Amino acid sequence: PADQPVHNYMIKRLDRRSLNAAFSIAVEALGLISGENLDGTHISSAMRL
Amino acid sequence: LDVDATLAALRQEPAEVQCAFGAYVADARPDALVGLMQRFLEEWPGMMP
């Protein structure tokens, strides 16, 4: 028997996955960068660096 | 020694017995054993279709 030309339609679905990192921050060392308790002396800026 | 389940699994379809010669036991009245064999040998072909 003869034949017909055959078509087709496909549907591929997306996927979701979220990779996440987390980095902590210090507590004691919170002023040096800051100026709430930063002080006009010279050692505070050194510790700040 | 767990047969309770399997034993339930076979009693769903009904089964027709074909031979009942060695699956049945009965008590006999006190009837003078020598005659009991005579009484039983007339029914033995009757229990083996």
Binding site: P1, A2, D3, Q4 | -
Partner: protein, 277 residues
């Protein structure tokens, strides 16, 4: 003529499933041009015998297109005998080329399209090859005759089927039937001289168990046997009655399948072309 089945409003869910019913057949009652879905609606599974009985009183119609609103159809046979069309094989078997098809009610239930909006259901019957629909009808009728993958009968209309059977079986007994019955041993003695003849007589033939139990004298000569010969009209009655026996119990063949290009065998759940007879 093309029946216009109108549809009420539907939830967007079941309309999409109904859209996939492009080749199944329905059963109207009146052949007006316009009709509503609520009309053609068969209850849930049960009474394969009563349902089979209710397929010869109504006529069939296959559908071709489902718009969101209306529903085209096709009155199957009222005036067409070459009207080509297509219908999806919804039976458990396959249907090769050339063999006729027949409508048989569904099996086991659980094959029913349920519409939530309309609160109705439809039971599209399966399509089997004639050669097996006959055998299924035979099986169902034989089982019905015992209450004087199997659903139990109701005894309500099983008696009607047994009546339809015993009528045709009684009217087969005629005065030449006894003559033909007289030669049962004269036929058995032939069935043991040739192989083919032996194969024509089955094993559970219920008559081989007669030719060993009963002897019968030569039959009495008919009233005025010299003028007419009885065996011939006996055989003619038999031919005519057996030609339309299964029809009286099951269902007539409705179309023969023919394909030009696609492969011959078509698997289930696949749409296949057909001409109707």
């Amino acid at each position: 003529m093309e029946v216009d089945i109108a549809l009420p409003t539907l939830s967007p869910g079941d309309l999409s499933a109904l859209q996939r019913c492009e080749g199944r057949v329905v059963f109207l009652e009146t052949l007006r041009r316009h009709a509503t879905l609520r009309e053609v609606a068969l209850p849930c599974g049960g009474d394969v015998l009563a349902a089979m009985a209710a397929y010869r009183r109504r006529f069939a119609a296959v559908i071709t297109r489902v718009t969101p609103h209306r529903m085209l159809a096709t009155p199957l046979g009222v005036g067409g005998r070459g009207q080509s069309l297509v219908l999806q094989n919804t039976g458990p078997f396959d249907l090769t080329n050339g063999d006729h098809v027949c409508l048989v009610p569904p099996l086991l239930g659980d094959e029913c399209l349920r519409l939530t909006s309309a609160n109705l259901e439809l039971r599209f019957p399966m399509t089997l090859p004639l050669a097996q629909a006959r055998e299924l009808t035979a099986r169902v009728v034989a089982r019905a005759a015992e209450t004087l993958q199997l659903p139990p009968p109701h005894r309500d209309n099983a008696e009607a089927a047994t009546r339809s059977l015993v009528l045709n079986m009684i009217f087969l007994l005629n005065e030449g039937a006894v003559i033909l019955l007289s030669l049962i041993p004269n036929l058995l003695t032939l069935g043991a001289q040739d192989g083919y003849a032996n194969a024509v007589i089955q094993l559970g033939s219920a008559t081989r168990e007669l030719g060993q139990l009963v002897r019968q004298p030569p039959p009495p000569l008919p009233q005025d046997h010299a003028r007419r010969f009885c065996v011939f009209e006996a055989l003619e009655a038999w031919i005519a009655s057996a030609s339309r026996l299964g029809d009286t119990l099951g269902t007539r063949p409705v179309a023969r399948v023919c394909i030009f290009d696609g492969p011959p065998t078509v698997p289930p759940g696949e749409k296949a072309a057909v001409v109707e007879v």
